[PDB]
Each structure stands twice: as C-alpha cells, then as structure tokens.
C-alpha cells in the first residue's frame, strides 16, 4: 500500500498572497503538499518568505512514504518565496538537480484585470 519512489519534482506556486509547495513524481502524480496558510500563518504572515520556508518543513514528510532524495524544482509566480523555500529543501536533506522558472508568461493573451486605483 504505502509505496516508495525517488526522482521527484517540486512545483512552487509563488503567488503574491500565498506559497504552494507540492512534491510530485516525474509524471505529475502528487505525493505531498504543504501551504503557508496551513502552517499556522494568516494575513501578512501567509506571504512572507519565512513562512514559505516553514511550509517546506511540513513537506519534509513523505520521507518513508517516498524516498525522493533527488528532486526537480519548478517555480512559477512572482510573489515572495522564490528563494526561501528553495533553501529549506536543501536543509531538509534533498538533492536539488535543476532549478527552472515555469512562470506563465502570455504573449499578449487574455486581458488582465484593471488597475487598483486604491
């Protein structure tokens, strides 16, 4: 039942309000995830780079469930947390092989929301 597998990939959704850390295999089947909002951080605390690192600490689970060891890194989103989280993976005992940005950049696609006059 509880399986075991290495050579994963980590998808990083660095949004302006939250950071989503998901560890998955090479074929997109999710193995585990953790979020800043689910790590005890709300409001401003839910977006600070630090809390994003803390979210990674949670994702350090699945160890016995999946011996990922070496994993890929996918990063998308301009929000804070494009650096912190990455460190936490190293300090957790993981082999970061490649680091690439997968931020969606339209070539003049859909119309964006209007500006916040505030």
């Amino acid at each position: 039942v509880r399986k075991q597998v290495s050579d994963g990939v980590a998808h990083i959704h660095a949004s302006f309000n939250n950071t989503i850390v998901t560890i998955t295999d090479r074929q997109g089947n999710a193995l585990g995830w953790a979020t800043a909002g689910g790590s005890g951080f709300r409001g401003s605390r839910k977006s600070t780079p630090f809390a994003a690192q803390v979210a990674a600490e949670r994702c350090a689970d699945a160890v016995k469930e999946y011996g990922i060891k070496n994993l890929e890194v996918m990063v998308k989103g301009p929000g804070p947390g494009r650096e912190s989280t990455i460190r936490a993976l190293n300090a957790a005992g993981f082999r970061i092989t490649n680091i690439t940005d997968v931020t969606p950049i339209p070539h003049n696609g859909c119309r964006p929301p209007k500006k916040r006059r505030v």
Partner: protein, 205 residues
C-alpha cells in the same frame, strides 16, 4: 547458469546503479553507494584501459543477466547482421523474453520477471514459452497466462511499472494484462550511458 549471490554487492560495484532490485525501497538506504565492496574498497582505484572495457562489458551483462558464452553468441550474431553492431547487440539483448516481460511491467525485477517466464506463466501468441532467451519479434502480442494473473506479485509489478517511463516500442495493457512488441527499440531510448563502440572493440580484440 544464473547469479545467485547478493545483489547490492554488484550494484555498488561498477558504480552507477543500473536497473537492479525491486526498485521501490531507496537504493541508497539498502547499501553504501560510491564504495566498491571489499575491505580495501574504501580507496580510489586508478583504473586502467583493460579495466574500463571490462567494467562496461560486465555492467551490460548484469543489467540483462547474460552469461559470457551467451553474450558472445549475441556479439557474433550482431557482427553478422547488417548495420552498426553495437545497437544491433543492444536490440538483441532488449528482445529477450525475460527483459521484455520486465519492461512490460509484469515483474518487479528482471530476475523475478524471468522467474515468471521460467515457471511457465507467460503466453506468447497462444503458445507457452518458458525460455527467457526467446527472441520476441515485432508486432507480437504477449499475454499473461490466465492462471498466472491470479498471482498478486504480478499485479503489484504492474503498479510499479508506471514510474518507469513506459518504453515507446512497447504497448502495455493494464487490465488487459497484455503487451504488443510494436517494433525493435532504438539507441536513443536506451540509457545514453552505454558506449556500444567500446563493447565492439573489446570483443574484436
């Protein structure tokens, strides 16, 4: 006619882990990689020229459990056949029934999938074959024997097959418990860490 000793010893020797053991439990945990066996293994061995050639040949053989005598017969056939010999030799090694069953996903290990073939549990084109070295020809359909399917080990091996990027030239069937050896494999698909030109020279010496 078969290797029966420990497996992690060979794995950690010759260095790069290449398709051994069930494939679930992390390879590093079971042993100590980057350290050849033996009391003196913890040292840097200045390999030679013969050394490199020998290692490659030994490595290739173990990946497919082919004994020298057998492997040499493949080399003679590969040289006889038209085309580049090294890829032809690799194609012949991949075309063995036991290897194909392993890649098809019915066995956790090449040895276990080979045992499934040996124990008369595999059907090819409606004919019972229990010879691991049988050469599968293109467009053939390999189907697990009705009785065999009741083995829960086969079922679990299917599950794990998902992690290995399904070989293109093999059309695997899940619940259908069948496979179609579409065509011969190509060098590109095979692990790019194999230098077949080294193998060709070594046996041509």
């Amino acid at each position: 006619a078969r290797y029966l000793g420990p497996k992690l010893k060979l794995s950690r020797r010759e260095g790069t882990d290449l398709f051994l053991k069930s494939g679930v439990r992390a390879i590093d945990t079971k042993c100590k990689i980057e350290q050849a066996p033996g009391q003196h293994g913890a040292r840097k061995p200045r390999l030679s020229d013969y050394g490199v050639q020998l290692r490659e040949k030994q490595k290739v053989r173990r990946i497919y459990g082919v004994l020298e005598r057998q492997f040499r017969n493949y080399y003679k056939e590969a040289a006889r056949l038209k085309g580049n010999t090294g890829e032809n030799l690799l194609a012949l090694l991949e075309g063995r029934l036991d290897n194909v069953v392993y890649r098809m996903g019915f066995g956790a290990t090449r040895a276990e999938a080979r045992q499934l073939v040996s124990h008369k549990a595999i059907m090819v084109n409606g004919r019972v074959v229990n010879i691991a070295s049988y050469q599968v020809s293109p467009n053939d359909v390999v189907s697990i024997r009705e009785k065999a399917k009741k083995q829960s080990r086969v079922k679990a091996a299917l599950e794990l097959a998902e992690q290995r990027e399904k070989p293109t030239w093999l059309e695997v069937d899940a619940g259908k418990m069948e496979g179609t050896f579409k065509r011969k494999p190509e060098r590109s698909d095979l692990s790019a860490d194999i230098n077949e030109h080294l193998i060709v020279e070594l046996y041509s010496k």
